[PDB]
């Protein structure tokens, strides 16, 4: 039950992907919908307006889905590699009240990326069942940048 729910394919449409903020100006736009695994082009990743631990990227499956894992990836920009090392996951079913993802009682800190091109998979165990997924970067190298895929099924 570990299928790509449509970040890369865009079965998860642009408007289902949002965030607390994103980095943009005259030359570049690193919007939430850029957070699609293996995306190419310029500005091929989500980037928050600013770098801190209170930021998040949100996916709205619009349906209830069984999420079994997430895959994350960094990006290289102007010869510099940016990526998220550690992140938290929260979830909701109304998009206002958010449930942290715990494991062994404690709040789960996932180990994400160590470079900018290699994708890294993280299981959700136990399988999370939700409409709204959130990912919260907590540490990172140089800057917060994210391309991702949600793995699951109906």
């Amino acid at each position: 039950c570990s299928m790509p729910l449509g970040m890369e394919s865009k079965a998860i449409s642009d408007a289902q992907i949002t965030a607390s903020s994103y980095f943009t100006n005259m030359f570049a736009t690193w919007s939430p919908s850029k957070a699609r695994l293996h995306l190419q082009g310029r500005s091929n990743a989500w980037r928050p307006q600013v770098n801190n631990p209170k930021e998040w990227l949100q996916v709205d499956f619009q349906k209830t889905m069984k999420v079994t894992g997430v895959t994350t990836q960094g990006v290289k920009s102007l010869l510099t590699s940016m990526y998220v090392k550690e992140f938290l996951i929260s979830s909701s079913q109304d998009g206002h009240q958010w449930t942290l993802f715990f494991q062994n009682g404690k709040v789960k800190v996932f180990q994400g990326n160590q470079d900018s091109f290699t994708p890294v998979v993280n299981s959700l165990d136990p399988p999370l069942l939700t409409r709204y997924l959130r990912i919260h970067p907590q540490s990172w190298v140089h800057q917060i940048a994210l391309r991702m895929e949600v793995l699951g099924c109906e």
Partner: antibody, heavy 115, light 107 residues
Framework: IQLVQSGPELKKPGKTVKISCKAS????????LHWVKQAPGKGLKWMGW????????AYADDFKGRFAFSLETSVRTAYLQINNLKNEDTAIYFC?????????WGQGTTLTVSS | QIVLTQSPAIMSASPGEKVTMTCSAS?????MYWYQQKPGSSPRFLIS???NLASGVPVRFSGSGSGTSYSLTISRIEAEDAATYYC?????????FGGGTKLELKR
């Protein structure tokens, strides 16, 4: 920016054709490639795309089956194969470099299926 | 999956006149892209990201809209603007073109 597709093809019903798409510069694994089909009186139909950094192809619903996308990165070329040709494959095939839109297009490749 | 619907199918205008042509999505998209195709030629990139002129494109062209409604305008049409104009979105699977607005010149 230029993309140069190969030339016109006449093929027998049921055979296979392989159409190519060569790129001028080498910013090549930096942008995705798309295939678009145009039938005589129709507009444009998206066939799908291929990731040029990873080689992952993706097909549109109407093109899952007898179509294959592929690459040769050394020579900066994308390919389009069509298996078991039918009359409905008769058309112009474009390739397009995605860059905040389909920003460059090849000149097209006419395919004619006929015995 | 979002469908694009362009009106009018055919439209007609005299050199110097303004033309507006519309493109409605079935559901919100992020941007709308536009293309011009003359017969026997490849399509050509006109408008990137709803309202930005693609490279090499003359300034009598402009696009706008948001949500599900977008439009292309040629402010002062010339003879070489006779063509078919396509809108296109890539906000979800699959990538889609509208069915084209054909601009004929009155003379």
């Amino acid at each position: 920016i230029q993309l140069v597709q190969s030339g016109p093809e006449l093929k027998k019903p049921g055979k296979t054709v392989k159409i190519s798409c060569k790129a001028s510069d080498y910013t090549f694994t930096d942008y995705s490639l798309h295939w678009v089909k145009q039938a005589p009186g129709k507009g444009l139909k998206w066939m799908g795309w291929i990731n040029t950094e990873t080689g992952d192809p993706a097909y549109a619903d109407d093109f899952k089956g007898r179509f294959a996308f592929s690459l040769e990165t050394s020579v900066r070329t994308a390919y389009l194969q069509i298996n078991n040709l039918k009359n409905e494959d008769t058309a112009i095939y474009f390739c397009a470099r995605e860059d905040d839109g389909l920003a460059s297009w090849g000149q097209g490749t006419t395919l004619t299926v006929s015995s | 999956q979002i469908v694009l619907t362009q009106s009018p199918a055919i439209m007609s205008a005299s050199p110097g006149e303004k033309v507006t042509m519309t493109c409605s999505a079935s559901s919100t998209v992020s941007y709308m892209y536009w293309y011009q195709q003359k017969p026997g030629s490849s399509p050509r990139f006109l408008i990137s990201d709803t309202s930005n002129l693609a490279s090499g494109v003359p300034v009598r062209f402009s696009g706008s809209g948001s949500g599900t409604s977008y439009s292309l305008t040629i402010s002062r049409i010339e003879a070489e603007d006779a063509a078919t104009y396509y809108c296109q979105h890539w906000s979800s699977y699959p990538l889609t073109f509208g069915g084209g607005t054909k601009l004929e010149l009155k003379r």
